[PDB]
RNA sequence: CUUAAAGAGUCAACCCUUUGCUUAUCUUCCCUAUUUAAAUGUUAGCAGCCGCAUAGGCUG
């Protein structure tokens, strides 16, 4: 499965992962991740990294994504399309923290507010200690941190370049 | 082989009565605080439905 490389140039001004977040945000709103384009990072050590690799099955040409990342050309480097027999695709994992589940339980189970806090008083508090990425959102108006972990491959992809199920 | 050797000090108590420390005053005069820088560690780890699950998935 052929892949192309996107390299974030080293900048003391902006964050290296912060450019990556704006790269991933601009790759979302300008299409790209329709149903087949996936993103892997060769440098999972503690952070996301700096080099971006897109391994779409039909192939990503250089012309389409040099105009997609037109706002990022100050500190980006777009490589040539190479080939790879296997990529390390990742998946999205969410963190649940108290009121994420409190307002869900009163909607479905029909319990009271004090009843819902009683069942979840001595539970929850999930905090992932794994690499994350601060990509925000445009449908719902807030910013958040998205966690990605290494697991098995999947055929289909979502609109974030990650695998589904 | 210790001036070794050894021995009950017990007892009871009214201190107490009185007083003028008073008066007096110039602390004052002077002051260069100063200068200068990244909030970073990616920051916030969110908003809901798919489900019996506070198991596991999706959505941006």
UniProtKB/TrEMBL annotation:
Q: Which domain of life is it from?
A: Viruses
Stated name of the protein: Uncharacterized protein
């Amino acid at each position: 499965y052929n892949t192309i490389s996107i390299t974030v140039v080293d900048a003391d001004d902006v964050g290296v992962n912060f450019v990556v977040s704006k790269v991933l945000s601009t790759l979302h709103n300008k299409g790209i991740f329709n149903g087949e384009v996936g993103v892997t990072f060769p440098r999972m050590d503690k952070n996301v990294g700096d080099i971006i690799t897109l391994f779409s099955k039909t192939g990503v040409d250089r012309k389409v994504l040099t105009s997609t990342l037109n706002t990022l050309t100050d500190f980006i480097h777009i490589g040539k399309p190479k080939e790879a027999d296997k990529v390390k695709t990742y998946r999205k994992v969410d963190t649940k923290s108290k009121g994420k589940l409190i307002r869900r339980c009163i909607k479905r189970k029909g319990v009271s507010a004090e009843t819902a806090e009683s069942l979840y008083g001595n539970y929850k508090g999930e905090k992932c200690k794994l690499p994350y990425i601060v990509v925000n959102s445009k449908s719902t108006g807030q910013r958040f941190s998205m966690f990605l972990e290494e697991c098995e491959n999947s055929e289909k992809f979502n609109s974030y370049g990650l695998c589904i199920v």
